């Protein structure tokens, strides 16, 4: 179906520890494929998926140039925003930026986005029509005026509907064996007595991709949200993800509960029982 | 490829 490409930038000023740290990561769907860390030795954009290494040297030189210019842009903006908020340079502050584009099943542009934060709160965001900005506070309206004068929205839209979509399509094709393949969860259940009269049933889902998944407990065929515990989906480290859901049940009645697993890689939902 | 527009804030 749909696919996305997304970049995440983080710039942190660090009084006493040198110039601001700048970290950039690129994702296609749930798969990281490039990174830049201003603290690393290479000073280069670096590959993080096999299929991005299909790109020639001009790609790596130009991306490295481009991402290091962005780090300088964040360095300037950190100083500019300090002045807007009247903050001293002896403090640490953080700019975060996320942007990207989605394509549909036909490979055609679906939507684009760009959101920026300062110190963990909304600063400025491109609106869904990609024609204007929503700034969140007074300082961000100063930014918004500058960006309107510089036609920043039209420039961002031109990337989002052009280069962004074109390179996403190329990445999806070069990475087809893994990016367009769905890995179904391997499931099992664990049982942990917590007292002489109660036990914990945990439903596991392991090795799945993409990261979207649904774990729901039932008792006697009826949905169970009471005394349940759902954990945040987590990376296994090899490109797949893991998740579990648990329920506390009366001891002796464990077999009256079922776990239900839904995933894009499953022809039909899975039902597990202890 | 990266493509955040870099007009100064």
């Amino acid at each position, epitope marked *: 179906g749909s696919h996305s490409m997304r970049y995440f930038y983080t710039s942190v000023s660090r009084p006493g520890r040198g110039e601001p740290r700048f970290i950039a990561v690129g994702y296609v769907d749930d798969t990281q494929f490039v990174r830049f860390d201003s603290d690393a030795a290479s000073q280069r954009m670096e590959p993080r998926a096999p299929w991005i290494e299909q790109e020639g040297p001009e790609y790596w030189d130009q991306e490295t*140039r*481009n991402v*290091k*210019a962005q780090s*300088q*842009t964040d360095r*300037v903006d950190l100083g500019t925003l300090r002045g807007y908020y009247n903050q001293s340079e002896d403090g640490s502050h953080t700019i975060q930026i996320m942007y990207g584009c989605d394509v549909g099943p036909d490979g055609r542009f679906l939507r684009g986005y760009r959101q920026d934060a300062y110190d963990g709160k909304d600063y400025i965001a491109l609106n869904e029509d990609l024609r204007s900005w929503t700034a969140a506070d007074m300082a961000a309206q100063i930014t918004k005026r500058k960006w309107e*004068a*510089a*036609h*920043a929205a*039209e*420039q961002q*839209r*031109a*990337y989002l509907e*052009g*280069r962004c979509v074109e390179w996403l399509r190329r990445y999806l094709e070069n990475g087809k064996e893994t990016l367009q393949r769905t890995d179904p969860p391997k499931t099992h259940m664990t049982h942990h007595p917590i007292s002489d009269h109660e036990a914990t049933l945990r439903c596991w889902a392991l090795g799945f991709y993409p990261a979207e998944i649904t774990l729901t407990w039932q008792r006697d065929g009826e949905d169970q949200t009471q005394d349940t515990e759902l954990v945040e989906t987590r990376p296994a480290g090899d490109g797949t993800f893991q998740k579990w859901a648990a329920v506390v049940v009366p001891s002796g009645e464990e077999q009256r509960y079922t776990c239900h697993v839904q995933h894009e890689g499953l022809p039909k939902p899975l039902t597990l029982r202890w | *490829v990266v*493509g955040a*527009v*870099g*007009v*100064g804030k």
Partner: T-cell receptor
Amino acid sequence: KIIQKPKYLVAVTGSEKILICEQYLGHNAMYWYRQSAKKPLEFMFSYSYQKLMDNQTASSRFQPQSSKKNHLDLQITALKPDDSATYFCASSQDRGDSAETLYFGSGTRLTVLE
Amino acid sequence: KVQQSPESLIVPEGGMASLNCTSSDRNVDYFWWYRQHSGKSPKMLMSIFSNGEKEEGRFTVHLNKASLHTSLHIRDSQPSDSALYLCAARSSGSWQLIFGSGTQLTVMP
């Protein structure tokens, strides 16, 4: 307020000259273009944050100097009469891939004589 | 490469000056029109960053991006409009303006 020195410049074949370009506008990108009869505004060099971003000059004799803030001087070595042209320095407030407009300095008219 | 037409144009005072500019580089996204008077430096006249048109005084710029085509319209032309008109383009992700060969406009008093 881009500053280009000098406005006119005679040089002898085989000599070396510096074309000065300074701006104190707080601009983060500076550029060099070349004006001749056949190419009114031929792109040469693009810098953002004192870093070379792009270059379309086919001679190593042209070396910009970007280590000094506010400057992008152009050094030309082993000058040839073919180098005679008007050299325009430009700047923009924002970096080169995002600039809304480029402002041009007055130009240095370079004439290389035997 | 940036292709401008016509190479030179003579219009009477009060007439319409029509100038065209196309790019052969399919990656171009933005266009500028610069005007350079003789002995002076190029000055930015109009800029256009998406499909459509923009009117400023006697000047209208149009952009048809699917054809990589921009046109500049100067109504009620003045002798002081006599100048070299330079078209410039830039692609998203490129770091400079690339200029065409220009149109020399003469407005006869």
